[PDB]
Amino acid sequence: REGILFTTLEKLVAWGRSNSLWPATFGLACCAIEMMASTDARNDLARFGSEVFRASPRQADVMIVAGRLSKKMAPVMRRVWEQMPDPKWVISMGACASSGGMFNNYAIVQNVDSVVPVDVYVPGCPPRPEALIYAVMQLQKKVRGQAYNERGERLPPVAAWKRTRG
Amino acid sequence: TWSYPVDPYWMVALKALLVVVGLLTAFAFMTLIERRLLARFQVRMGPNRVGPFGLLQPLADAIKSIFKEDIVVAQADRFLFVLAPLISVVFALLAFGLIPFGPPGSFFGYQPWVINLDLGILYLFAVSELAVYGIFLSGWASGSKYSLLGSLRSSASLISYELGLGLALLAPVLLVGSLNLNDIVNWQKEHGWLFLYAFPAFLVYLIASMAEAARTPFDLPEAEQELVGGYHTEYSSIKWALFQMAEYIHFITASALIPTLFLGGWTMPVLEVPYLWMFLKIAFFLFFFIWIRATWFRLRYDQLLRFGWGFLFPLALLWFLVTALVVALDLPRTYLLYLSALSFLVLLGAVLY
Amino acid sequence: TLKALAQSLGITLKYLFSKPVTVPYPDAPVALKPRFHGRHVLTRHPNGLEKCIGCSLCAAACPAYAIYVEPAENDPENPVSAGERYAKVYEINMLRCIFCGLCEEACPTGAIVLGYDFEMADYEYSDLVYGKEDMLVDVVGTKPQRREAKRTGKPVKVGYVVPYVRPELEGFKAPTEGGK
Amino acid sequence: MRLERVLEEARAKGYPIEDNGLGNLWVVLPRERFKEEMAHYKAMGFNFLADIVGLDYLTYPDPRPERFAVVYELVSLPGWKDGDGSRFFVRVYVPEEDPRLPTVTDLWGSANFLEREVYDLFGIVFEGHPDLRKILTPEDLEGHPLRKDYPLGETPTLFREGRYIIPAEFRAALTGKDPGLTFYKGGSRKGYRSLW
Amino acid sequence: MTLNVGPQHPSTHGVLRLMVTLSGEEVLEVVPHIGYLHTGFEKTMEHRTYLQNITYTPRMDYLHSFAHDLAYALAVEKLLGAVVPPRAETIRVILNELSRLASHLVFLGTGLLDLGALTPFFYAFRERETILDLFEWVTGQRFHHNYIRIGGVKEDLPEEFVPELKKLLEVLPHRIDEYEALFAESPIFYERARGVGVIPPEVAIDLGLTGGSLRASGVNYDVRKAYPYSGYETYTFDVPLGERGDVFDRMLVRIREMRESVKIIKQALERLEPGPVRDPNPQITPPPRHLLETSMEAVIYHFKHYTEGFHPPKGEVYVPTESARGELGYYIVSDGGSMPYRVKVRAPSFVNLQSLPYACKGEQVPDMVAIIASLDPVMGDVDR
Amino acid sequence: MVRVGMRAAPRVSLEALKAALGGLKLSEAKVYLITDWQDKRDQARYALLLHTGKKDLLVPDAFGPAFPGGEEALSELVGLLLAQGARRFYEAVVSPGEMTALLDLPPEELLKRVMAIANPTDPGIYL
């Protein structure tokens, strides 16, 4: 029941969800290859708990928006995001997803927070694979409830808990 | 069960419960070991993380698995959707008790095994059919024909090789003359390592078990990068875990049975220690099978069915008929050693062209 | 051609016993080349004067338009830049920045020059607009790194190592080849 | 070689030949003669259709005959049966209020997708197309992006305290018709070309 | 079964939608649906100075991007007649063949993983990292590197680049020969690839399938021989070809292309003599960074070039090149302004994709994956 | 295209929008919530452009929490659009200097600009 209502139990389940981040592959653009390189045999996102990679949205919690989110893919991704279990986290990978990138035009959503609740933002073009590990570590200590912004605020464990989805 | 004793029923329940929880912890740590061995295969190293040895990552994964929004999909069957994992798991756990882990009493007083049925291989075969049952049933229940075709692939291929399993298993019965695994094991103690007599059948059994979810048809199928498989794609929290668990238990059950019947299920001529040799041979078959997992491609379920039907089953039935010739005329047992050695030399020397 | 299955097994095992190749970031620092495109830095002359003379060439040549420069006049008594002009406001949106290097290539004083840090992931958009005093060469680390050093009591640890820092990065503090 | 024979065939037919000193050839065909001429062009052995590029000449400083101009690229593979290697372009202007052009689907199937793109990017409808379905832009998108009267749709870049930028009013680089920040543009910035 | 292999699923690389008209386990015909990544490079490029568009060029075909960089550079140069020093051109062809190696590595890793086993994805992709390290050495960027310029290249090579490159040129031939020993005597990959993928050269030509799979159908049609631009006239060159268009011959040709590319790398690097790096014509190349403190004219040219840029003559241009996916080119219309009037890209994978319903027609459902991977599509190229 | 409501009057604009909306079927209509300052929604102001396909409707920058009680009106508004069958919600980001003049442009220019620049939005962020 939501991972709450005991001081030890919420710490425990937050620990589990933090290190057991099961990525949901959503490769969009050239960010995708520097995403996969965070799993190659120089630098693997295969230690923290993300070795296995369930392409299914019904089985993976972290959605890595790796590339430009073109508008014709937005509504589809929409349902794909709703086709995730509720304990889900959404990372915005790359400049084109986090921001509009250099493609300031009619074609691209200029910030993916519009359609999906973003957990962590990561600048870069392409973000070095180790920066992707840094972003998942950021998300790690966020879902543990150990993350603070520049204004001093603690951030909720799971973004996408605060939106009247519909 | 002429020569084997019986523990009390409460001890039967205790031993069954211990076997189940052992299978749980075992498949978890074996998922870890498979990941790390794959890593060694592909230069990349495994999770030096949450452990030290990673041996606490499975607990984190399970703790996430619960609380993971076990969802009842709309447009799906209310009942079968939830019910099928119970079949796939239950009828997977069992069919492991028969495997002898030692002589009677080597369980610190009572019994290495759980049950020693008179007709064992039939029990294994019957409950083996039910794993495929649960698989394709889950494939249907999703109400997604996307996964449905994968479930059909599963059932078709596994059932073909499941038939082949019978023609494989026929032959050693002629030598042993009993359908209890323990008598076969004692035979392997006396005459020695049954596979020396029936290596081809062993192959067509081994290869058959490769089709039974280990890998390489690998049209088991899984969703990844192809027409999605059955028993997944709609389950979220525990039922998906239940399916992966049952498939891995089927894997380890085959990887333990193969040394049990043909090779030396424990019964070692050396040091004759009850448990360690059996566990070591299980782990050996695991190492080879994982080598195959991260070393061989798919067979597409078309060439796989053609191969199973045209190659495995005629060969297995022919070997059974030959063994039946020798047993019915019953004069030698050496003739089978000679013919099996020749057969192995054929299936091996034909490669190095 | 049945031999190839056995050969595949063999090569996979050969690579099995070949244990090493990987680097465990962040436990092992990534070796970055001295020319890497990283977090911008604003550089100072030896005199202590800042190099930026606020000429808006980095903003004009910025193909992503992430650079905004509000200028102001040097105060002769306590000057900040070397000329008669300095940059009162220099903010860069790391989410817009595509890491070209044109800002460096146009900077006539060598003030704005790409750095090396890549550990810049943060949670909020409006916090990813790095400011002048968040990129000056005086500082040691990225914004989330500094914030963690405050909320943690633990000093900043950079997760990269480089053979050396370029001359154009005079002053840029980094681990250098192991001399320390 | 077949390019030279195209030249000797067309020049007698009154088709102007546009050439820059770089080695690229344009042959301007009118609307009608286009179809049968290019049918003969395939019959001449022009296997390979590389490009179908749509052009909006609206914002070009010098005026042109028509707003839209579609250019096909015909080639002959050097390594096939009779490989010359002749590659050249065919330009055909298309009216702003009459975006008609017969397809070359019957000759090449390659123009299946390519022409569709021009119907997506420009208001050009290609007659004789198997299926003119919008390829790239979202289904609910209204209009044709690449024509100059269609906005690029820029969105401002954001900063800390109310400070923003609108790029189209920010860009210092000048297009052809923008006279510049001085009274005018002359010399090198009205066109510059070095002499090898 | 009009089955919808939807966008990005199941793990269909190169986000793409496929409506497989299919009864059973065969493939009647697949109706493709693309456009899921169209960002508008042909449009956004009309609004960036000639110097800036080099930042838009690589990011479209993000695997073999240096073909984009070089094609755009050559088109603009021919438009304004700039001279690339021989050392600059040689470095350009070195980087071109190197990114070709990286591209083919990624392509075969993705293909092998797509159906079958996962393992060999790593080793080849491993080399990519090393190659990337090489690039990170010179361009300071993994990919999307902004190095090339209209006159030539941005700046010079460090002393540290050549040794790492020689080390890789020593390890690569053995590595590639290992993959080929694994592959050529294929046990199942033979029964998986040799028969599948009917590529009649007539149809591959009619659909313009240039992406290296046409030479698998036996058409020796390569720009490196057909239209030498960057000195390939000066290289000892094997142009691999396939007898019958299938997956197997395709893959073998691509591997031999990798080895010959390594040989081209050796050849180019060996002939490397000191010299200049780009056309010093100030309208074409920004002033050298050292005399910014000496001349007014220096400040004027630097300022104008980095704010306005330069204005090439009124005219249209095109130059083709050979990408890891076939014939590429830029139709660039310049109106005498500091920004190009229009930039159209001949997207090789865009025209090459028309051959999917034909190719996968009658093949199996699983083989529809390999027959896509055999084509090596990059949807950043296609949607564009 | 009609213009109803006025600047900075969430309740008047909302009630006029209820009345003028009626039983309009929005199965293929498009809703553009134009705003400034992409990130900071905490103090955001919102204008609305409703393109039904057969006629269009404009409401100026009168919605959003930047006005007192503007979020409650915006909540009722998005709930209303969702009730009538709307599926496609869009947000366009324009400069504050644009937003005011934009409502004085001809219908064709305003509508073309907005439909060109739109960002698909999750309506949940405004509920």
Ligand SMILES: CC(C)(C)c1ccc(CSc2cnn(C(C)(C)C)c(=O)c2Cl)cc1
């Ligand atoms: C399992 C991994 C993480 C390796 C995985 C993750 C995601 C995908 C599908 S995204 C994807 C992948 N490759 N490509 C290329 C450029 C190679 C064609 C794409 O264009 C796209 Cl869009 C596949 C595999």
Ligand code: SF4
């Ligand atoms: S941020 Fe760069 S690497 Fe990532 S999708 Fe955008 S252009 Fe590609």
Ligand code: SF4
């Ligand atoms: S590197 Fe960043 S700040 Fe510099 S010109 Fe490019 S986008 Fe602008």
Ligand code: SF4
């Ligand atoms: S180019 Fe350099 S001197 Fe000019 S405004 Fe930018 S940082 Fe300052």
